[PDB]
Design a protein around this ligand. Sequence first.
Ligand code: 118
Ligand code: 118
Lengths: 268, 268
Amino acid sequence: SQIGLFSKICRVTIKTLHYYNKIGLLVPAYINPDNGYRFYTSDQLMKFHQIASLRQLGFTITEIVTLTQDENSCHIIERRRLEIQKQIRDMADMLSRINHYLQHKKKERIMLYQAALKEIPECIVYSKRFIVPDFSSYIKLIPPIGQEVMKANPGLTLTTPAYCFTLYHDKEYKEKNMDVEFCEAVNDFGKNEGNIIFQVIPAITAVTVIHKGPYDSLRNAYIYLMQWVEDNGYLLTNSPRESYIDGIWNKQDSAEWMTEIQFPVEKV
Amino acid sequence: SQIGLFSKICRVTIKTLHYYNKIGLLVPAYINPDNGYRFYTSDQLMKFHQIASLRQLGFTITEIVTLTQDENSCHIIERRRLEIQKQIRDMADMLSRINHYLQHKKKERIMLYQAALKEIPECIVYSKRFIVPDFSSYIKLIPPIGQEVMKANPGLTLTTPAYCFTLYHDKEYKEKNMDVEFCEAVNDFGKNEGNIIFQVIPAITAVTVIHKGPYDSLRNAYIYLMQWVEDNGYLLTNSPRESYIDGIWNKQDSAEWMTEIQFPVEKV
Ligand code: 118
Ligand code: 118
């Protein structure tokens, strides 16, 4: 059976048979030496059937070489079983994500906020946890802390890139009784004089959305994020953070400012 | 903020930012013409955030380059949703097949048969449907059926490759007095003579198993295939075909016989 007839028997292209010969997966029975023409037999169709049966299960080519040459190799198929289970979980989450994205673009003509699930590493921060009467009053008392901590810790260099955020330790919603904890990441340990202390903040996977503009609309992102958090079945494992990209330090106009709200979540 | 500090903000590789810049997506703010350095600003971070959100959604890069600026293009999102649904369906299929594979390999030392789905086209066959008392009498009676057909039709040329097969239109296991229909696909129309007719057999999606051995033990294969259709949640849509590829006519050794069982099947 010449390669054309055989390629139509097994119903696959010629280049596929060329490739399977090139990698040594399916070798013709008899190659004519001067022309190089490949001729197969029935016992090449018998092997191509096994090859295609394994290849419909997603096995990579080298995995098929091993599956056909090494017997009692059930650990590689089980490994592939676990990987396929992981991709099914991931694809179902993707389904929920794309349903929510389509649900939004029909709900609003503009996508104001996209939600990204990113991993944030562990940090070394100086932290002050305290009650706040008003979030507007919360903004002013931070540069005093900036003076104070650099005073008490000489030569303490903050991490680059700068990570300056807020934990919201409140389990429900209110506007004037916010129990917050301001954390900012530095390089080394330090002195703990004052309400300012040092602590290690563990690495977390968190869904974050970046809101750009003034802070009075920031709650929007939270409602959105909360929707997201409930829609895709994620569970909020820790208190929500808010990391400051743009603000009074870089830029003077308060409408081009930008913060990023981060929800610590776990997949359940 | 050079590309290193920006790549450390997003926790992304320098090569990814390079690739994005090459493709036109996420062009940086300032490319210094003396040394070609790349400086990024936080607005580029805001753009990269939605880039990373879509890349976390499964969207290919050309789809992100078309989605990040032409904000009206929405049909491409239900289209991606349909692609993901197709993949989830096929992955669930694959998962059922891998679990069935694992149970069967843990069962027996030797994997005798290996099922594979393939799309068999429609084909113009000549057919003869009739009753047989046993399998051996049937095996002996096919060749005179072929001889009668080649005599009654002058100029009848078979199709290459030779798709010559039979159908068991019974639904339960009938060992004797079988209602069997032999058929073979030909090049073009002939004239109906006797009880042999011509017709066009429609294209199917068939789960196939190649039996190597004498014909009286093809039965095993069917049971296996049956388990495969009940286990992996497929459904037998039509009478099972059995195609003869290699056998007593081409090689007189009984142990080099090849028959390709084809269950017409549909997904549930
Ligand atoms: C110590 C404590 C706070 C700040 Sb900053 C800041 C943070 C990261 C990168 C640049 C600046 C600040 C504010 C105004 C003027 C100058 C610096 C800051 C304040 C509130 C909330 C978040 C960050 C700086 C040092
Ligand atoms: C019409 C009917 C049967 C056969 Sb064949 C056969 C040939 C090629 C591929 C598959 C089957 C046959 C028999 C003798 C000499 C040459 C060809 C055949 C034989 C036994 C059982 C079933 C079919 C051929 C034409």
